[PDB]
């Protein structure tokens, strides 16, 4: 059994997220089949299931901008919500509860981090031509390859210990 | 009335070869076949550890116990090894939505230091190694993704031309 999850890792906000798990070892004809997120400080929010005939339940806390949707035929279901602001920015999982452990959880995609991004630049950008906003594009290459060597090399000595302790 | 899932503590850090036991408490009453635990290690999903209480999934070493009933369930480790250092989430599968707990980190006390790393045996120190990687590869990924954030007003001002 495994679940498959696809779909896009941004999202700007009041607009749609939808993400597609591609079950492929059962099929979603059978049991039941949720939707879970995980919120950065470690909470995780059941957003809802889609049964083994097509009912669904969705989390009050949602409201009704969540819909849950599935294709029979490609033994796939969907995730969708609607008008998203930045409170949505979480990992969101697909999973199969199973009946024979009294539904727990025994099967989980890979998630997909979802981010959702304010982009209110609109004042600032506009006194910008073409060209300066091309320059600040690449402007943030070599900003990023910093952050990411830092990274790399704050593991470099968090794992020298170990080495080190393996050579004795 | 939803039913919340309080994990006490939070963190915790501990040697290994010690014993420990962290708990959850539920709102209100749940039957033992319904509260569960997952263990999540960075980088990948959750895994299903312990169901209804008191059975192991498979894989999961014996070390692992649980026990429990009414608002009151725990999960114990016997003598803890470098791998079970994870986040630990209980959840009830009773009522919707099925609410989980909002973990237990449980980190490796004093694991970063020469001085007690040298006393691990040669297959605990290489699996730990390694364990490292998912942790850094999902920190460059968060500012991966952070920078696609950045990336995005400046692709919407270059085409609003
Ligand atoms: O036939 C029966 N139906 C049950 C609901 C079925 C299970 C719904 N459910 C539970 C738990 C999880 C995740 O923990 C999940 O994704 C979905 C009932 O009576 O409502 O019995």
């Known amino acids: 059994v495994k679940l498959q999850q696809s779909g896009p890792s941004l999202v700007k906000p009041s607009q749609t997220l939808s993400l597609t798990c591609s079950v492929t070892g059962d099929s979603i004809t059978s049991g039941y089949w949720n939707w879970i997120r995980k919120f950065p400080g470690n909470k995780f929010e059941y957003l809802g299931y889609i049964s083994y005939s097509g009912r669904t339940y969705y989390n009050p806390s949602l409201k009704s901008r969540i819909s849950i949707t599935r294709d029979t035929s490609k033994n796939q279901y969907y995730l969708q919500l609607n008008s998203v602001t930045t409170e949505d920015t979480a990992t969101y999982y697909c999973?199969?509860?199973?009946?024979?452990?009294?539904?727990?959880?025994?099967?989980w995609g890979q998630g997909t981090t979802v981010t959702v991004c304010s982009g209110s630049d609109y004042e600032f950008l506009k006194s910008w031509t073409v060209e300066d906003l091309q320059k600040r594009l690449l402007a943030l290459d070599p900003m990023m390859e910093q952050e990411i060597e830092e990274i790399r090399q704050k593991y470099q000595s968090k794992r020298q210990p170990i080495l080190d302790a393996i050579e004795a | 009335m939803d039913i919340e899932l309080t994990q006490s503590p939070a963190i915790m850090s501990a040697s290994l070869g010690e014993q420990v036991t962290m708990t959850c408490t539920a709102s209100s009453s749940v039957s033992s076949s319904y509260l569960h635990w997952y263990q999540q290690k960075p980088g990948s999903s959750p895994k299903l550890w312990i169901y209804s209480t008191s059975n192991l999934a498979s894989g999961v070493p014996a070390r692992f116990s649980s026990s429990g009933s009414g608002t009151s369930y725990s999960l114990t480790i016997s003598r803890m090894e470098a791998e079970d250092a994870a986040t630990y989430y209980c959840?009830?599968?009773?009522?919707?939505?099925?609410?989980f707990g909002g973990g237990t980190k449980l980190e490796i006390k004093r694991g970063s230091d020469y001085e007690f790393l040298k006393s691990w045996t040669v297959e605990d120190l290489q699996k730990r190694l390694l364990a490292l990687d998912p942790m850094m590869e999902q920190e460059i990924e968060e500012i991966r993704q952070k920078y696609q954030c950045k990336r995005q007003p400046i692709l919407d001002a270059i085409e609003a031309k």
């Open positions: 959840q009830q599968s009773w009522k919707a939505p099925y609410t």
């Open positions: 999973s199969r509860p199973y009946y024979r452990y009294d539904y727990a959880i025994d099967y």
